[PDB]
Short mmCIF file of C-alpha atoms (C1' of nucleotides) in Angstrom, two decimals:
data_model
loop_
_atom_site.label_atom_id
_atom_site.label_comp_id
_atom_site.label_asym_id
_atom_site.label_seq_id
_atom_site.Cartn_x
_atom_site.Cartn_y
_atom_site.Cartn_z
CA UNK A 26 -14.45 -34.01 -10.09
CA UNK A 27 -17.42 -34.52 -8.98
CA UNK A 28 -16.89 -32.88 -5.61
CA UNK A 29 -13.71 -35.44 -5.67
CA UNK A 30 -11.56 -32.13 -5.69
CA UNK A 31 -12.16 -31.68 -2.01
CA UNK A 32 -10.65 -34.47 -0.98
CA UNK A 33 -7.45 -34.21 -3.29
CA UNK A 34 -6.46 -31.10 -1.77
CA UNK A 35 -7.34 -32.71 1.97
CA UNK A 36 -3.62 -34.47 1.12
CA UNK A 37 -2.06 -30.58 1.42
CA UNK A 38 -3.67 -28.33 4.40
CA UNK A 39 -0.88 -30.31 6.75
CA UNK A 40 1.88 -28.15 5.44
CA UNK A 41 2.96 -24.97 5.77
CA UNK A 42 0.65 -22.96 2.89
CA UNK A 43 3.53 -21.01 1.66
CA UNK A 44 3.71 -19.38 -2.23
CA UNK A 45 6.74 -17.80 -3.79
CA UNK A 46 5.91 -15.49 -6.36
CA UNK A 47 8.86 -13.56 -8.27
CA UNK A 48 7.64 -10.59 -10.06
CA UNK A 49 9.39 -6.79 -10.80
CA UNK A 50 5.95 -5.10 -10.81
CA UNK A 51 4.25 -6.31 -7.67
CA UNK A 52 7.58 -6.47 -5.93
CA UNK A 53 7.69 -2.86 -6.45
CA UNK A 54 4.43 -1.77 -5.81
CA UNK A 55 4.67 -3.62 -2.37
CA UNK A 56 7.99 -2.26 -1.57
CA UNK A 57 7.02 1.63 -2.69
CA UNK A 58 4.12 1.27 -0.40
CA UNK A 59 6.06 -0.30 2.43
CA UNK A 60 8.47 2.98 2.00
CA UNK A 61 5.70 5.42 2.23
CA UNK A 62 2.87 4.80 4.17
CA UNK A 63 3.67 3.40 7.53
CA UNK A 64 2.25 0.14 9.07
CA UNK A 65 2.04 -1.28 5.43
CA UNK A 66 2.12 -4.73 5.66
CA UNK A 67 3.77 -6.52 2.44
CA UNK A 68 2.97 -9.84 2.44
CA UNK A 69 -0.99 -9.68 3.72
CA UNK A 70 -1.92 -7.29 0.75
CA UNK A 71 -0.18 -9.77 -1.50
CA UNK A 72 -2.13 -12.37 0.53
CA UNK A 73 -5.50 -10.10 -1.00
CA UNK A 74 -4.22 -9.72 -4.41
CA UNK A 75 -3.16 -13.21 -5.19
CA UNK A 76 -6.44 -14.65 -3.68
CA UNK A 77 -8.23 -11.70 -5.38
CA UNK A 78 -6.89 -12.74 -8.92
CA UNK A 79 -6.83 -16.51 -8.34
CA UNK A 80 -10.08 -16.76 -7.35
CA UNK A 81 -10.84 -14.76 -10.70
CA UNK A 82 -9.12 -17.13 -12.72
CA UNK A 83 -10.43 -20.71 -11.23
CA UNK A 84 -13.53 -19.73 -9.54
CA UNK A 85 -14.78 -23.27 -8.46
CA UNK A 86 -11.43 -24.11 -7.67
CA UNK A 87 -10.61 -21.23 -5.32
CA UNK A 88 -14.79 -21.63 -3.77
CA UNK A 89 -13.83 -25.45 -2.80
CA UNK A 90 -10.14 -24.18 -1.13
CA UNK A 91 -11.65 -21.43 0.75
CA UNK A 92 -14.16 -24.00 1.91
CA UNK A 93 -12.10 -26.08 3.19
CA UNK A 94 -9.79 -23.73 4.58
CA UNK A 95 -12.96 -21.97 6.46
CA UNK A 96 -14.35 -25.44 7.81
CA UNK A 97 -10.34 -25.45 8.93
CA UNK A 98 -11.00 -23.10 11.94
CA UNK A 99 -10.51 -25.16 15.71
CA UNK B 5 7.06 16.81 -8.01
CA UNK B 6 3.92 15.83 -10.47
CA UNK B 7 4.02 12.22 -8.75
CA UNK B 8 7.12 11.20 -10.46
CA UNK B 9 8.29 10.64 -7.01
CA UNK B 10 6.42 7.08 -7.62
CA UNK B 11 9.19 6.27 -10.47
CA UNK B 12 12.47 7.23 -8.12
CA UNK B 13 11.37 5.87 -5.08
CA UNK B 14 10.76 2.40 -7.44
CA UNK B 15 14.39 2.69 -8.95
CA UNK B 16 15.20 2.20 -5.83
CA UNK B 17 14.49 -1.39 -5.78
CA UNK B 18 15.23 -2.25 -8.98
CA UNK B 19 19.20 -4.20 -7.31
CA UNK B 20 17.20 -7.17 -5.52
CA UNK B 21 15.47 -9.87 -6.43
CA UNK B 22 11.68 -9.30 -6.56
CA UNK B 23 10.64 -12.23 -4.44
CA UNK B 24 7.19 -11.89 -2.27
CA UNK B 25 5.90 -14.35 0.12
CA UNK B 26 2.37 -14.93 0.40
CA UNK B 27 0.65 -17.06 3.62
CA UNK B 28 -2.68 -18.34 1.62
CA UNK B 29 -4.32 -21.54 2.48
CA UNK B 30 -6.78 -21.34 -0.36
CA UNK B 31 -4.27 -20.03 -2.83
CA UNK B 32 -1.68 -22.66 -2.06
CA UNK B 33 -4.32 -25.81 -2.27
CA UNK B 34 -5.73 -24.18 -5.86
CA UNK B 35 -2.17 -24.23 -6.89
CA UNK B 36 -0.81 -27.53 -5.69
CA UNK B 37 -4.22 -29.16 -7.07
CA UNK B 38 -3.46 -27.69 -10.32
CA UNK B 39 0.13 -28.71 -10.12
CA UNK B 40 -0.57 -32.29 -9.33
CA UNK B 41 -3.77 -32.75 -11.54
CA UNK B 42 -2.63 -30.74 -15.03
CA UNK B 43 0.81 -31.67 -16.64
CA UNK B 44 3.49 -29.76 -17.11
CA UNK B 45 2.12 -26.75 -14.40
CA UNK B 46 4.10 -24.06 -13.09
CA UNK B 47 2.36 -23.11 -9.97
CA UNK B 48 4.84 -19.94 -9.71
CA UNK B 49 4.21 -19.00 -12.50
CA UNK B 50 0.17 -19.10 -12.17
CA UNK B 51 0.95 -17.41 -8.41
CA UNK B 52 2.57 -14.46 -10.39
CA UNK B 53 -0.39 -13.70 -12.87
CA UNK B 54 -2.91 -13.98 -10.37
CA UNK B 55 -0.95 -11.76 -7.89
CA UNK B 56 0.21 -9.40 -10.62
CA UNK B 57 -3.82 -9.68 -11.73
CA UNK B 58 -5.20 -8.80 -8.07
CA UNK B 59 -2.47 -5.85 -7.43
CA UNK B 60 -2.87 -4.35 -10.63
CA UNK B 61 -6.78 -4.26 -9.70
CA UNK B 62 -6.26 -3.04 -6.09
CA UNK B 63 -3.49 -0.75 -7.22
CA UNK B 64 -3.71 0.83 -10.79
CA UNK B 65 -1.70 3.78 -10.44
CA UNK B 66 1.13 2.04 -8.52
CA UNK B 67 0.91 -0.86 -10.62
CA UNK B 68 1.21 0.85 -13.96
CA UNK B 69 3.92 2.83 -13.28
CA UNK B 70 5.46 -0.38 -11.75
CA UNK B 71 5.10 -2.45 -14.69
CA UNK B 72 6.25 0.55 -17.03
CA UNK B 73 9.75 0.58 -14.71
CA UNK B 74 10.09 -3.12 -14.97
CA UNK B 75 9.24 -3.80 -19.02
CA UNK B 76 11.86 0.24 -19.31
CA UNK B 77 14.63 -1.26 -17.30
CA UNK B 78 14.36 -4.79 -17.41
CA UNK B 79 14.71 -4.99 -21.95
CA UNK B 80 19.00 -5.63 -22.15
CA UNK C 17 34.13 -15.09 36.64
CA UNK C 18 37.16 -16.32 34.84
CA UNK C 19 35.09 -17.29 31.38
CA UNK C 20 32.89 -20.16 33.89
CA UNK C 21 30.55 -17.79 32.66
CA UNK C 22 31.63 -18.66 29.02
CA UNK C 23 30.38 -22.36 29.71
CA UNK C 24 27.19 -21.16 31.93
CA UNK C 25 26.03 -19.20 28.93
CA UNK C 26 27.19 -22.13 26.35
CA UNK C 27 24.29 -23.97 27.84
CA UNK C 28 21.42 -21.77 26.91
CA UNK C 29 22.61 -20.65 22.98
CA UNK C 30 20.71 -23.66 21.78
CA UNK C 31 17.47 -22.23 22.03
CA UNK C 32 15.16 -19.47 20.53
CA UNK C 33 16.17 -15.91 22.55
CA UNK C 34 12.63 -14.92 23.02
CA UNK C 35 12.67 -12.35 25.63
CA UNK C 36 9.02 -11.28 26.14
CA UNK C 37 8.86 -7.96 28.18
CA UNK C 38 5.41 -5.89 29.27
CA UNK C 39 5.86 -2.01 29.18
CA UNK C 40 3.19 0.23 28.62
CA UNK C 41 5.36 3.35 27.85
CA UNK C 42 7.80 1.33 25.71
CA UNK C 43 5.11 -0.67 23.45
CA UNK C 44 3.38 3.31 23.38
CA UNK C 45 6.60 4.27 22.05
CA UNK C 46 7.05 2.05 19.49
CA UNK C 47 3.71 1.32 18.44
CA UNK C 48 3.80 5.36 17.68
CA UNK C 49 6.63 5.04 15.54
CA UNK C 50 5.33 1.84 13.86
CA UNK C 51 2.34 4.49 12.89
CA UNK C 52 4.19 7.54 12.00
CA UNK C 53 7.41 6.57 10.45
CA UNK C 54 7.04 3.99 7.40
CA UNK C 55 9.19 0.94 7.39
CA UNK C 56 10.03 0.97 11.47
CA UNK C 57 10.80 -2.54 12.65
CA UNK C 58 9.57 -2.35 16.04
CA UNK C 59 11.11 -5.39 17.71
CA UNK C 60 14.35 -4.80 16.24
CA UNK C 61 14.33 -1.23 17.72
CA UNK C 62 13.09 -3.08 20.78
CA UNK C 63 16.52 -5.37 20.56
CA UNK C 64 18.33 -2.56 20.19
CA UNK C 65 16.86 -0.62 23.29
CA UNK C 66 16.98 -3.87 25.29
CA UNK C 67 20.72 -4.72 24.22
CA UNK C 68 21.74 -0.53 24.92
CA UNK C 69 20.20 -1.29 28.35
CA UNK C 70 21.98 -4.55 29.34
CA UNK C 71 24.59 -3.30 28.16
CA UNK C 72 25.28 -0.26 30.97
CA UNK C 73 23.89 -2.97 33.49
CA UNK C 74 25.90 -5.78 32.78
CA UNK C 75 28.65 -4.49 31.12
CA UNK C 76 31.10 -7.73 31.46
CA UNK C 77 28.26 -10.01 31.29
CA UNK C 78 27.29 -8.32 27.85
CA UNK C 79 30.84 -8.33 26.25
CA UNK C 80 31.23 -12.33 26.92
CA UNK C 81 27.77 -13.05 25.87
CA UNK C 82 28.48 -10.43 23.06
CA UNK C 83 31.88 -12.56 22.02
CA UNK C 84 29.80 -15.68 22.12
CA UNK C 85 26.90 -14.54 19.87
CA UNK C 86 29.59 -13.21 16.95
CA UNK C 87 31.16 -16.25 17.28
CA UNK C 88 28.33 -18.24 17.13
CA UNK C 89 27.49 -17.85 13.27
CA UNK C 90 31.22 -20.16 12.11
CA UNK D 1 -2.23 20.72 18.00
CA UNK D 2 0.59 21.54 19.29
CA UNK D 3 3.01 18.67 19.70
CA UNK D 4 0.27 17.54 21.76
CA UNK D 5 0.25 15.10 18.43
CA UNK D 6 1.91 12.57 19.66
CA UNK D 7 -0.26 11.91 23.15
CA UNK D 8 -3.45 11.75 20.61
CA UNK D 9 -1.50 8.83 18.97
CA UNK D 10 -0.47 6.80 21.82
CA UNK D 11 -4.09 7.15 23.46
CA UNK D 12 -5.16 5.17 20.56
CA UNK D 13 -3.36 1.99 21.89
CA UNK D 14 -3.49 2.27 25.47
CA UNK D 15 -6.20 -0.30 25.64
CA UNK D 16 -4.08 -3.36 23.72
CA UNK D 17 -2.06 -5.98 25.55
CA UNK D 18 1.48 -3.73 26.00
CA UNK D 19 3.50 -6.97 24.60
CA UNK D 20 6.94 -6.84 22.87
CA UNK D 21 8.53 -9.87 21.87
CA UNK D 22 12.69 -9.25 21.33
CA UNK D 23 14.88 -11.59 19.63
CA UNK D 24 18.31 -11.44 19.97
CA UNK D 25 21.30 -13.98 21.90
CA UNK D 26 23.85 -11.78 23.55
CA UNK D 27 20.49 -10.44 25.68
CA UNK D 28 18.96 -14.27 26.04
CA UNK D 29 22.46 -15.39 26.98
CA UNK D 30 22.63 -12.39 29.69
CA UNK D 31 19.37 -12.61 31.22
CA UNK D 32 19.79 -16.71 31.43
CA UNK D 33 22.82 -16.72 32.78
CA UNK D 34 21.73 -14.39 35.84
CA UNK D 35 18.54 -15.75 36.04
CA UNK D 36 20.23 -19.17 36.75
CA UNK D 37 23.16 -18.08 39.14
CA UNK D 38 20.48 -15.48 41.20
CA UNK D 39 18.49 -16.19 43.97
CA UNK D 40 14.78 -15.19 42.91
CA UNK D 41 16.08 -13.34 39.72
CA UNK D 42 13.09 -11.57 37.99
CA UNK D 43 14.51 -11.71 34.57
CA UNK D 44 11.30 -10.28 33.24
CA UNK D 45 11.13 -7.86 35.49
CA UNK D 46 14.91 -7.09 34.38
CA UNK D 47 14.35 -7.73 30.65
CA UNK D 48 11.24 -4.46 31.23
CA UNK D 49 14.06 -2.30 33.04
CA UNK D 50 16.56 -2.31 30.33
CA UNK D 51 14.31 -2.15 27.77
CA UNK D 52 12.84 0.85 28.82
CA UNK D 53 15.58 2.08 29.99
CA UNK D 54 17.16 1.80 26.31
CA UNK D 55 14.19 3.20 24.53
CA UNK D 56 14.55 6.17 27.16
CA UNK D 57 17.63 6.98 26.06
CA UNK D 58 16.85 6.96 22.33
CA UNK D 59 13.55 8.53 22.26
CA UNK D 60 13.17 10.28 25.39
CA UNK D 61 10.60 12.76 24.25
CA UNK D 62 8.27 10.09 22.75
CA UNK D 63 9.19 7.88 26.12
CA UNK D 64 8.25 11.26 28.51
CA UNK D 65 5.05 11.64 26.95
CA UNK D 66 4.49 7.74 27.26
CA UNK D 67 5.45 7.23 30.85
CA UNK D 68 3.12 10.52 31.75
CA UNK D 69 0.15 8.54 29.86
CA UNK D 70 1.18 5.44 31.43
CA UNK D 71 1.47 7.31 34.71
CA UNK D 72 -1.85 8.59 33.71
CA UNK D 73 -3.67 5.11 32.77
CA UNK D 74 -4.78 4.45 36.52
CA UNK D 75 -4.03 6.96 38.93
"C1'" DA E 22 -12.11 -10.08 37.17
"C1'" DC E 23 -6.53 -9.61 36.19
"C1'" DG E 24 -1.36 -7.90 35.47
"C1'" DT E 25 1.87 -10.27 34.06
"C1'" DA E 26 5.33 -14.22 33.24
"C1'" DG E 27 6.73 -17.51 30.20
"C1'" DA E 28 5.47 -20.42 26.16
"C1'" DA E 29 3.51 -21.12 21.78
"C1'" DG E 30 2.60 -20.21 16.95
"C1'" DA E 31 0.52 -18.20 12.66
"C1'" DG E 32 2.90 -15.71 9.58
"C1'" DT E 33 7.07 -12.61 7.23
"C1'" DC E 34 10.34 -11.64 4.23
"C1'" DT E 35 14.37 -12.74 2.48
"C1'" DA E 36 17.68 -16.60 1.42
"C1'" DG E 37 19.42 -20.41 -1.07
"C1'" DA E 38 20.04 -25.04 -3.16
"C1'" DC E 39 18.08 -26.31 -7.52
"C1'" DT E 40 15.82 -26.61 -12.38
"C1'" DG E 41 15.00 -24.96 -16.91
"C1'" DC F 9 21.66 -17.59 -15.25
"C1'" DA F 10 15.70 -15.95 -14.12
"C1'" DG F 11 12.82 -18.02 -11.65
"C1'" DT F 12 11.25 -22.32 -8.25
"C1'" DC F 13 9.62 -23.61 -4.06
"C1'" DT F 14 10.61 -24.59 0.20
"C1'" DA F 15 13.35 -23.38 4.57
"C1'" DG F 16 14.52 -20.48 8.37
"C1'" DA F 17 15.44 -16.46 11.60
"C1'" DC F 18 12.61 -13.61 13.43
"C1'" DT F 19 7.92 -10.65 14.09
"C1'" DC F 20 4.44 -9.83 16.69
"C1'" DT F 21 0.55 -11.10 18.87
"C1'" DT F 22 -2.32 -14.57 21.32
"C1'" DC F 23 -2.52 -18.42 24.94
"C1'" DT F 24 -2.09 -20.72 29.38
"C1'" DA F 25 -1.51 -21.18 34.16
"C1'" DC F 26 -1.38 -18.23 38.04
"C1'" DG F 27 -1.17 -15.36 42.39
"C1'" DT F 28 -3.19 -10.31 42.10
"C1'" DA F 29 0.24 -6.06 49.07
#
DNA sequence: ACGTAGAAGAGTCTAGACTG
DNA sequence: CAGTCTAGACTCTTCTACGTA
């Protein structure tokens, strides 16, 4: 815990990073904006408000993923 | 038509299963830390409040009307 | 003829059918619509165009690979 | 403006990488199959010719104006 | 400096076998 | 059965190796 986090989510960046949410609300909102302004693009604005919100919710959590996910770059 | 066009382009949608895939390294290594250090998590279920949290921030309008047409028709 | 070209074709269906084509007038074309009109799927449009043009060049070729394809998903 | 719309649009893209990636078997099957029983088959070159030729066919005003800027680009 | 052919791959968006 | 969570066809754009009369 004491920067021990890092290296328990090491174990999970080797698969594919992929989140299933199921929601009426957002679903809609996505899909109502995919229907009327063109070039929307669903899933990368859900990409900003899950990360938006998560990173609201565990804020030490989300700085040491995006860390490592930055450092990820090669 | 006073932006109720929001509400019947929604219903819509209302048929299919609400399901939205999200592509987030970060997100996905909070969640499966959480899942495999707390018991009992749900990470879905932690992916929907953040997401709903986030799009409800970025989107108020949308959003509210949204989550009006899901508590409306989503009750029986 | 005579359906060998069943069994020349039978070889290739177990790979991806990535066709990658380079035309500035048709990526203007549907890059504009991807822009204008909401929703467009360009590279489904783009199968569509490509599978409208085969078939008026290869018209036999088309309906046997065509047969194949529908048959494929049993 | 004056229908002159849609050139201003397509201007704004001239300068990407004109790529378009197509998924589909009866075309894969087609183009393999010739490219494998034809001496020096372009297959590329073929894949470009029916494509446009399709999109021609169902948008030719958007596919006029683009060919005339494409035309245009260099000479 | 390079137009373009193939090849490769991060992502998409829905699907589906599976729990609760 | 409503949601889970991962799997897969398929989307689009980058990448690489390569002759550009």
């Amino acid at each position: 815990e004491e920067e021990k986090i890092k290296n328990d989510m090491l174990k999970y960046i080797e698969k594919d990073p992929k989140i299933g949410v199921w929601s009426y609300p957002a679903f809609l909102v996505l899909q109502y904006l995919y229907h009327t302004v063109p070039g929307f693009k669903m899933s990368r604005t859900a990409k900003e408000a899950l990360e938006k919100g998560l990173k609201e919710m565990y804020p030490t959590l989300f700085t040491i993923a995006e860390k490592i996910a930055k450092e990820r770059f090669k």
